[PDB]
Structures are given as C-alpha cells and as structure tokens.
C-alpha cells in the first residue's frame, strides 16, 4: 500500500468493506518491522518469513475476493493492484495452473537457485515422503530459506 498523492485515483465504492481486513495485515507488518534483536540467525530468518507469509496472506485474500469468492468489482481490484496492497505477479502465478497455492515468486526462479531448479517446497509432500521411504530417512526439511514454506502445496 503506497502513499496517497494528488496522482492517486481514490478507492472506488466497495473498498469500505475490505479496509479493516487489510488494515490488520498492515498493522501486523508494522509489528513485524522493528529491531526484534534476535541474536540467533534462524530465528531472525523466521521474523522475515513472518513478513513474507503475511504478504502472501494479504495478496491471497485479495485474490480470493476477486477470483474464488467473486465478490469485489474489477475496478476496485485494479486500484488495489496499482496501490500494491496485493502483489500482481504472485496473483498471476496463482491464476496459472499448478501454482494454485504458491508461497511466493522467489521459490520458482530457477536462476537464483544454485541447482537450476525450483524451491524444494514446490515438491509435493507426498513425493518427498516417498523419497524418504525409499532412502530410509524422514522429511529432512521443514521450511525453505526464501520464505516460511512447509511445503508449497501444489496439492
């Protein structure tokens, strides 16, 4: 959510319904932004994931409102996108088949990953289980580094 200028087209009619929902998200983000001086590394990353997951949830909310629930108007949605309450790219990915669930965009860039391949969270849990069984071990991981993703839930 950006800052209201003269160049900001004001929010259309149906925004008054949703404001308090995404307001909460905003508040959370504010809470999630501060020097919570985690000496630890893993926990520090955890905080970051809290922001990431929160972002996902907010964007996911707007996506739901637009597409699954089919409630809010198109203009309103557009406005929201422009203001960036919800990430557009993420939504686009969601709309595409296979990524119906998707933590975030960073988990599907094969360039960034040292092995030219997606984030392990994208591997469906069942597959991982199968692999583990074959090997003998259990699910080695619980959440990837890029975001707090205990499975990315393609299924």
């Amino acid at each position: 959510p950006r800052i209201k200028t003269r160049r900001s087209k004001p929010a259309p009619d149906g925004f008054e319904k949703i404001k308090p929902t995404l307001t909460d998200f905003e508040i959370q983000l504010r809470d999630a932004q501060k020097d919570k001086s985690s000496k630890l590394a893993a926990k520090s990353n955890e905080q970051l994931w809290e922001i990431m997951q929160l972002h996902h949830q907010r964007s996911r909310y707007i996506y739901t409102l637009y597409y699954k629930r089919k409630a809010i108007s198109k203009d309103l949605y557009d406005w929201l996108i422009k203001e960036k309450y919800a990430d557009k790219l993420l939504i686009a990915k969601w709309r595409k088949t296979g990524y119906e669930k998707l933590c975030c965009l960073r988990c599907i860039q094969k360039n960034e990953t040292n092995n030219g391949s997606t984030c392990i969270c994208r591997v469906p849990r069942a597959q991982l289980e199968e692999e583990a069984r074959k090997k003998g071990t259990q699910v080695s991981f619980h959440q990837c580094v890029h975001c707090g993703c205990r499975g990315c839930a393609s299924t």
Binding site: Q53, C103, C149, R150, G151, A153
Partner: peptide, 23 residues
C-alpha cells in the same frame, strides 16, 4: 494415488495455507 487421500491429508497440517506444521 486417490485425490481424496490428498484431501484428508492436507487438513492434517496443523497450520493453514502455505505454512503447514506436519507435526
């Protein structure tokens, strides 16, 4: 694999949505 097995098993994750607990 049966798609109802995945339906029952994706509610076993104690958290909602992307972060599941899976125990």
């Amino acid at each position: 694999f049966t798609k109802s097995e995945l339906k029952r098993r994706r509610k076993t994750r104690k958290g909602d949505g992307p972060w599941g607990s899976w125990s």
